[PDB]
Design a protein around this ligand. Structure first.
Ligand SMILES: [Mg+2]
Ligand SMILES: [Mg+2]
Ligand SMILES: [Mg+2]
Ligand SMILES: [Mg+2]
Ligand SMILES: [Mg+2]
Lengths: 66, 79, 177, 112
RNA sequence: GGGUGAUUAGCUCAGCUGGGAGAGCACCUCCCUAACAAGGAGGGGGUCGGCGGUUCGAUCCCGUCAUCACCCACCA
RNA sequence: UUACGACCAGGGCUACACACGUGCUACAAUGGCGCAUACAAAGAGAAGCGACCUCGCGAGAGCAAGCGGACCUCAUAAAGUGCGUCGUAGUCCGGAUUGGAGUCUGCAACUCGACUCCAUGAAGUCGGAAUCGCUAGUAAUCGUGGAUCAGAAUGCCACGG
RNA sequence: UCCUCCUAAAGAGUAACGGAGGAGCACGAAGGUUGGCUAAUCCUGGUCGGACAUCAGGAGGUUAGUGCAAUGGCAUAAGCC
């Protein structure tokens, strides 16, 4: 490129708390250990939990213990 | 805020609702029972409730079941 | 690259049969990524634009070109030539590296993330996205930043339709809605 | 340091209270359920325990989810047409306090 | 018929070839007082006459029209 | 005097651009928060006070003695002290305002009750001109009780440190 | 006193107390060259960000720009780096 006007680029290997470790090229300087990556973030199971609202007569029905 | 057991409803307003679901949707029910809560079998009705001087009609919605009819009828008018 | 050959196998095999293309030159490919950040508030002081350029260069392995206002607008209290934003063009290897290190470890870090809009296509197959928060990239260490300056991504591809852009971009596992 | 936002420099019990949705007792329950000493600070915690703290906080509605939950509550009342909703729209106290002289918090700074 | 000047808060007026736009008294509240005045504390106001124009800015700069204030209408 | 009298349900007396009077809680380190522990006086109670015990994180709920009371209950007094921490930040100060979850009393807590738990954490960093009380167990501060009262005191009336 | 247009009657010129505007400078780059480049405006998507800021692609094709009036000119740009 422009011959040393750009930041450093090193093949680091970033790690995750739930596995998910890969060989990456980035300008960081230390392999940061982050939380769930794309392989574990709940956008495949959490879709069920995405519709978290529903049921008000349910609330009425549960209060009716009489 | 109400009781541990036995939610509250006036008898006359309970009877009018049972007569409603028996006879289906009908003309608005005029009641003064601002204290009686809402039951699920009142949803779809257009019951009118007192505000001290007039019966303001309220169309019961799925959400308004844990509340009381007077909660949807203001009493004092401001501006 | 890491994802270049991945694309060249899976996406090409998929889109050769999806649209009955007669040639491999017909299946759309992504050509560049444009990382934009219009600081706007650097009219107050240049330090903000320098800081934002630092963050952009940290995020993407390239120095950011400083973009100056094209025309004077009295509403925004700027005049022609005021340095007002930073922009990075990523192509080829750096393009794919940033694409992977985004769609892997930067979208998951979005606070309250439930999916990127799939209808947000300009009509020419190109896609755009806002982050509202730069810290979502790992390169920001929280110990040298000052603000939460947001960022904009524009994935410019050679597709000729929104359906084509969506088809190309879904094969990479794009966290749409 | 994590927990969505950054807890800084404080004892783990009281640093964790910076989480929107975690107060004195919830933070005590979290540290009890994580087996972390109350008196120790956030900089002496291992990365092998903060992950447990993330697990513990995950059993509670927090910043993103909570602020949405509160906003849903107020809006549902505002759209409901009930008295509580009406008070929310006009900015007047909902719990049933005076409006003759007090209620400067809900009304805001005084204006003639 | 010709020429000149002024227009800024409710009133009288200051205001930098740019910079929220200021002063007295009027107005608002509170003190003082039996109660008012006077006095003392806090506070708010604006079409900068109006569309216009070289301008990094138009209050003061930029042709104009609107109005009110003048001045001149001599030899004839 | 077939209503200015009488009855009923609902509403209002609780409104709210603002202004004033009297108060309570604070703007902290002579303090906040945890653990341990000391020292009162006065008073009230029979459709009432309600031990102990069990279940509730709690408000308390069930069972249930005793007491018309120098006997029983309300009733562990709190400031204090001892230890530890917090290290001057709108904070481990402030505890408003809102969102849920509830307990009680009451035929009934929406207008419009009190209280508990979880969450939130607003003004406020000692107050302009002016102005009030107090001369000794007084001012200041800390808690307790009673009347009214089914429930509802930051008010009132009392008590002691 | 000077510049631009019209009056001015298709060469030049052409008056009035005719109709409209400007100048009394600026620039050691805003001059010379050699390379390179091409606007205004609108539409669509995009974090604060909207009527309009920066970004991406589409229309459009000089309606832009020229140190300052007006006229003539300028893409091989005379415009921008
Ligand atoms: Mg009545
Ligand atoms: Mg506290
Ligand atoms: Mg609390
Ligand atoms: Mg003072
Ligand atoms: Mg050239």
């Amino acid at each position: 490129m422009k011959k040393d006007i750009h930041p450093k680029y090193e093949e680091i290997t970033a790690s995750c708390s739930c596995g998910n470790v890969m060989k990456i090229r980035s300008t960081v300087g230390h392999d940061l250990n982050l939380d769930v990556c794309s392989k574990c973030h709940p956008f495949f199971t959490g879709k069920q939990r995405d519709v978290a609202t529903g049921g008000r007569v349910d609330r009425f029905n549960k209060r009716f213990n009489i | 805020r109400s009781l541990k057991k036995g939610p509250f409803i006036d008898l006359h307003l309970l009877k009018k609702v049972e007569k409603a679901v028996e006879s289906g949707d009908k003309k608005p029910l005029r009641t003064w029972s601002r204290r009686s809560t809402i039951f699920p079998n009142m949803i779809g009705l257009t019951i009118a409730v007192h505000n001290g001087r007039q019966h303001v009609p309220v169309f019961v919605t799925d959400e308004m079941v844990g509340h009381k009819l007077g909660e949807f009828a203001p009493t004092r008018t401001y501006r | 690259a890491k994802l270049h050959d991945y694309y060249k196998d899976e996406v090409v095999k998929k889109l050769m049969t999806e649209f009955n293309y007669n040639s491999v030159m017909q299946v759309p490919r992504v050509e560049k990524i444009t990382l934009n950040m219009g600081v706007g508030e650097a009219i107050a002081d240049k330090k903000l634009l320098d800081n934002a350029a630092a963050d952009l260069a940290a995020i993407s392995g390239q120095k950011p070109l400083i973009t100056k206002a094209r025309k004077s607008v009295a509403g925004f209290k700027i005049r022609q030539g005021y340095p007002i934003g930073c922009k990075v063009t990523l192509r080829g290897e750096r393009m794919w590296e940033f694409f992977e290190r985004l769609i892997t470890i930067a979208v998951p870090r979005i606070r309250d993330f439930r999916g990127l809009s799939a209808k947000s296509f300009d009509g020419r197959g190109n896609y755009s996205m806002g982050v509202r928060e730069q810290i979502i990239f790992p390169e920001i260490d929280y110990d040298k930043v000052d603000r939460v300056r947001g960022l904009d991504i524009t994935i410019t591809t050679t597709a000729k339709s929104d359906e084509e852009g969506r088809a190309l971009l879904a094969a990479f596992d794009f966290p749409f809605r | 340091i994590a927990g969505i936002n950054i807890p800084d420099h404080k004892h783990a019990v009281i640093a964790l209270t910076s989480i929107y949705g975690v107060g004195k007792t919830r933070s005590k329950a979290i540290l009890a359920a994580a087996g972390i000493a109350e008196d120790v600070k956030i900089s002496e915690l291992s990365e092998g325990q903060i992950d447990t703290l993330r697990d513990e906080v995950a059993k509670f509605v927090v910043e993103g989810d909570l602020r949405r939950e509160i906003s849903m509550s107020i809006k549902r009342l505002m759209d409901l047409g009930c008295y509580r909703g009406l008070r929310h729209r006009r900015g007047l106290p909902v719990r049933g306090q005076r409006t003759k002289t007090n209620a400067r918090t809900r009304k805001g700074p005084r204006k003639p």
